[PDB]
Structures are given as structure tokens and as C-alpha cells.
């Protein structure tokens, strides 16, 4: 049976790296890694390089696509000092590693000849303020489609891929568990925009942000494993993030391994799991590339969309 | 506010025709026109030519896209005696003109230097047999997403765009209002495949046929007008299609203008309208191009997806 997909194992995927140079150090990789993530330079070599490659092969092949339409419209022939931004989406569950995969990818792509302006934006800042969520009875649905100002998010990405000089996005504080008043992330006509979020790959009755993606990644892993990663990380934050008195979850810092496991599991059970199952996972089929990780966090398989 | 779209009026759209030659006659155009459709060579000049153009500009620009991926995969460099088929979807309501728009488009594209194999397939043949519909209680939902073997449809298009030598699709009889036993439409590695259907542009929890489209058309028009076209055509068929004794609707042939209007309106009210509103119209936002028709069936406006 023919397929739109083609899968790989790490063995065969790494062979597609070719001369693709490794331009990241260990000190560097580290400041990109998130708590609990196991990524090392090796993985960046056998997985992220063949990927950085693919992406570059398509950045050019994609500019052709907006050209034709421009040629068709008898329009000028756009200056390469400002071509059409290449949008990349990185999706996946809470605690799966999106943040790291996205951070690393941006590091690699920025370190490409010419030094392309590679901006990274998370959908966090597009969450409705806690006050607005309290108003809609969603304080326990943070992460669900409805907890996002999807209208603003679309306005943002649209603005950037449509050639705007600069666009603004709100900023989210993980420390305060809310949107930061008066804060803004400014994106000035980047060459590449990486949008990271749980939702990003979603589709609906209206043109959405996933409809503006030129390439997209979906970081996958077995669900019982993501819960483990999730819980585990929760316990580990008692001494990192939760340790801070200014933290909205400072009260978890004192929990015992036992109590902490209980609380972690309940959040997983009542928020992140349902969301993963009802909204995220059903978007995986549309991902250009899927990075499958084993219980140890290692990416040992991949599924590519050839069609 | 920036937009992914750009609109036109017929004035400005026609200017994008350029040297694009008209290779269709009046005798020809006619055998492509459906009952009630008003299309003439003029419309084919000021609307369908600028379109045939756009499409050609992108057929090339799109082959680049599968190349890059092929180059990336260290794969051969595919023979132009069999490149990757360009898929085009034509969507819209019952009685809006899809069939004609699709037929005409195919005629124009086949009459392009080199004479590219341009196949046209309607999703009609992918409806479940009346018996299977009776089994599922859907005999009054013909046209709704669930009344289609969407699995087979996906298998079909996937097979064709994935380079298969030939793929088969069932055939639907409008005379018998059901699937024809043992009938098959065979498609052999066409250069272009046009898939026409109400549903085609749909999206969901699984990779769908709309995810394989390289370009897509959505024939639009005001809903009160489509009902008029629908009813009107219903009355007109009393002496054409319904006149045949072998017709599943031969009993409508004897209705009076009055009774016929009543029956036509009830079908519209209970089947086609709800479907248009709940399933088709919500897909219009994703269409590469939208052909807006006025009450007189004339296409006087267009909305193009530049992003
Ligand atoms: N409560 C928290 N306080 C501070 N930082 C957090 C908190 N929760 C998650 N983070 C960090 O912010 C990011 C959240 O990632 P998550 O939202 O878990 O998606 P993913 O792990 O796939 O990137 C990660 O860097 C995570 O370590
Ligand atoms: N009951 C019928 N019997 C025979 N032909 C029909 C019947 N209903 C529709 N047709 C024809 O088959 C096609 C049906 O088109 P429809 O399904 O109405 O979509 P559209 O008009 O947009 O192409 C048109 O050619 C129409 O004229």
C-alpha cells in the first residue's frame, strides 16, 4: 500500500547528513537543553543535521512557490534582502521536548552561511491572561485550544509571513504562571520563524496558523513515557523553579516525593493527558516530520511526509 | 491588516491572462456546460485563462518541492516521463457549477503544449452503495462526509500522487442514483489530477485528500442563489433526466411547477443546505482560489491565497 510517509531508523536517517557541518559546542548545546532532556552532540549529528539539511533544501524550493504567484501577478521580483519568511511549526505534548528541539533547530539554522535571522516564538504568550481565563472558567484548561487568543496568534504569524517590518507577540511568565504586563517580543522580518506550541498543528473552520507553515515538526513519544517525564520533572522542580519564593508553585517545593507524585499525576490526568489525546495527537498525521523518542528521550525513529 | 488573501474583480483578474491562448470552441465549451450554467467563451477568456496560467506557473514551481526532498534523500532524479502528479481540488455546493468549472479547467490544461494527461475524477463514485447507506441510516445524507468511503478515496488519490501506474475508482450512476456494479474509472499516472467534490477540501484527525492538493478551487455563490439554481434545475430536469423511465426520479417528471418547487425546496432544506452550511462552507477559507458567482451565474469576483 503506497504511503504519503516514509519512515526511518536512526541508522538510515544519519546517512542523510552528508557534509552538513556541526557548528555547536557542548557548552552551547547545554544552554539549549531543558531540564530532563538528554540531548548530546551525537544526537545533534545523527538527527538534527540531516534535518537542518532537508529544511535548507526546501527553503529555496519554497521561495520558488511564492515567486510563481508573484510572476503570475505581474508583480516586481522581490528583493532577497527580504524574501518570504519560512515558517516552521514544532508541536507535541507538554514535557516532550518541543522547547529543546526548537531551540536547537534555531541555533543550527542561524549558523548557516549568511547568518539568516532565525526567530523563535512560543504560543505561551498567546494564552489569555489568568484573569481572562478565570472569566471563561478555563483556569484548568491552560493548553487547550480555547485557552489561546488564536485570533491574535494568527494575526501575528500572518503579519510576519506577509512581509511586515516587525510584529509583536505578548510574553508569558512561567515564574508567575501568567502573561507579563507590557511585555512584548518583537520580530523584524526574520528569514525563518519557528513557532513552538502544543496546538500549532491544529486545523479548523478558519484559516489557521498551521496553514501558514512551510515545514513542521511533531516531537512524539509513548504516552506513558511522557507522563513519566512529566512527573519526574515535576519532582525535580521542587529545587529549581519551585524553590523560588516568587514562584506561583512555591508551595510544591515542600511536597514529599510521594505527595509530589500524587499532585503531578492529577494534573497530568486532568489536564495535559486529555489535551494530548483530544487535541495534539490528532494533529500528528499532518506533521512534515515526526521525531519519535524512546523512554530514554532518545530519538530513534522518524516518519517523513514525502507527500 | 495584512491578509493571506488578495481579491479581485473581473476587470483586474482578466489582465493576468497575457498571451495565454484560447484553444476552445463554442461547440466544445457547450459539451462541457451543465444544465443551467451560463458560461461562454468570454468568461473562459477573462477568468479561466488567467487561472490556467497561474496553475502552469505553479506546476513547475511545485515539482521543485518534491525534488528538494528527493535530492535530500539521495534518491535518483525522477524521469519527466513520470513526474509527481499535480493534484487539484474543486469544491463547492450542489448546483454551484463545480462540474462545469472542473470540466472546462481540464479541457484547457490538456490543451497545453506537450498535451499533458489531465484526468478528472468526481467523488461521486466514492459514495457508499445505497444498500450500505440504508444499512447506516444515511440514505438522506448523501453528500455528507459520512456518506463517503473516505478511506478508499484517500487510498485512490494517494496511490496516484505516489506514482502508481494506474489506480481504480468506482463509478456512480446519476440515472440510477447509485454505484454501478463492476464499473471502474482507471487513471494511469496522469500529469494532472482534478478531484471534484462537495467534501474534497475537508480536514480532520487523519491525513486527508485535501492534504494532497497542490492547488484548489472553491466555486462560491450566495446561498439563496444556489437554492434558486438548485430548484430551477430540479424543475428543468422533468423533461431531461427525469423524463427517462429508467430514472430513479422518473416520478418527479409529472410534478407541476408548484409541486416540483415544493419537493425541490424540501430536499434543499433537509439535505443540501445543512451540508453546505455545516461541512462545505467551513472549508472555503483553505481554497487556493475562490470563484464568486453572481445570481446570474457569472464569476465577477475572486479571492486568491497568496499565503
Ligand atoms: N512550572 C514551570 N516553571 C518554570 N519553568 C517551567 C515550568 N514548567 C515548564 N517549564 C519549562 O518551560 C518549558 C515548558 O515545556 P513544556 O511546556 O513542558 O513543553 P516541552 O517540554 O516539550 O518544551 C520547558 O523549558 C520547561 O522546562
Ligand atoms: N438527478 C440527476 N440526474 C441526472 N443528472 C444530474 C442529477 N443531478 C445532478 N445531475 C448532473 O450531474 C452533475 C451534478 O452536479 P451537482 O452534483 O449539482 O454539482 P455541480 O452542479 O456544482 O457540478 C451536474 O452535471 C448535474 O447537472
Swiss-Prot record, chains A, B:
Entry keyword set: ATP-binding, Coenzyme A biosynthesis, Cytoplasm, Kinase, Nucleotide-binding, Transferase
Principal subcellular localisation of the protein: cytoplasm
A GO cellular component entry from the record: cytoplasm
Gene Ontology BP, a term: coenzyme A biosynthetic process
EC number: 2.7.1.33
Sites where the protein binds ATP: 92-99
Cell compartment(s), UniProt: Cytoplasm
Reaction equations catalysed: (R)-pantothenate + ATP = (R)-4'-phosphopantothenate + ADP + H(+)
Superkingdom per UniProt: Bacteria
GO molecular function terms listed in the Swiss-Prot or TrEMBL record: ATP binding; pantothenate kinase activity
Functional pathway: Cofactor biosynthesis; coenzyme A biosynthesis; CoA from (R)-pantothenate: step 1/5
Annotated family: Belongs to the prokaryotic pantothenate kinase family.
NCBIfam families: panK_bact (TIGR00554)
Record-given protein name: Pantothenate kinase
Amino acid at each position: 500500500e503506497p504511503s504519503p510517509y516514509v519512515e526511518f531508523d536512526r541508522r538510515q536517517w544519519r546517512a542523510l547528513r552528508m557534509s552538513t557541518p556541526l557548528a555547536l559546542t557542548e557548552e552551547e548545546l547545554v544552554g539549549l537543553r531543558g531540564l530532563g532532556e538528554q540531548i548530546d552532540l551525537l544526537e545533534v549529528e545523527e538527527v538534527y543535521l540531516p534535518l537542518a539539511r532537508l529544511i535548507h533544501l526546501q527553503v529555496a524550493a519554497r521561495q520558488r512557490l511564492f515567486a510563481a504567484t508573484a510572476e503570475f501577478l505581474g508583480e516586481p521580483q522581490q528583493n532577497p534582502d527580504r524574501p518570504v519568511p519560512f515558517i516552521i511549526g514544532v508541536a507535541g505534548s507538554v514535557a516532550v521536548g518541543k522547547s529543546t528541539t526548537a531551540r536547537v533547530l534555531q541555533a543550527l539554522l542561524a549558523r548557516w552561511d549568511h547568518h539568516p535571522r532565525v526567530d523563535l516564538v512560543t504560543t505561551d504568550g498567546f494564552l489569555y491572561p489568568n484573569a481572562e481565563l478565570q472569566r471563561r472558567n478555563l483556569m484548568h484548561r491552560k493548553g487547550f485550544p480555547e485557552s489561546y487568543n488564536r485570533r491574535a496568534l494568527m494575526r501575528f504569524v500572518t503579519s510576519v509571513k506577509s512581509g511586515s517590518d516587525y510584529a509583536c507577540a505578548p510574553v508569558y511568565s512561567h515564574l508567575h504562571y501568567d502573561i507579563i504586563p507590557g511585555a512584548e517580543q518583537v520580530v523584524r522580518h526574520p528569514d525563518i520563524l519557528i513557532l513552538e506550541g502544543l496546538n500549532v498543528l491544529q486545523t479548523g473552520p478558519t484559516l489557521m496558523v498551521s496553514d501558514l507553515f512551510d515545514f513542521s515538526l511533531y516531537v512524539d513519544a509513548r504516552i506513558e513515557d511522557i507522563e513519566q517525564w512529566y512527573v519526574s520533572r515535576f519532582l525535580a522542580m521542587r529545587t529549581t523553579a519551585f524553590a523560588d519564593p516568587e514562584s506561583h508553585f512555591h508551595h510544591y517545593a515542600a511536597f514529599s516525593d510521594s505527595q509530589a507524585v500524587v499532585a503531578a499525576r492529577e494534573i497530568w490526568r486532568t489536564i495535559n493527558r486529555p489535551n494530548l489525546v483530544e487535541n495534539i495527537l490528532p494533529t500528528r498525521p499532518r506533521a512534515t516530520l515526526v521525531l519519535r523518542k524512546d523512554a530514554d528521550h532518545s530519538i530513534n525513529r522518524l516518519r517523513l511526509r514525502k507527500l
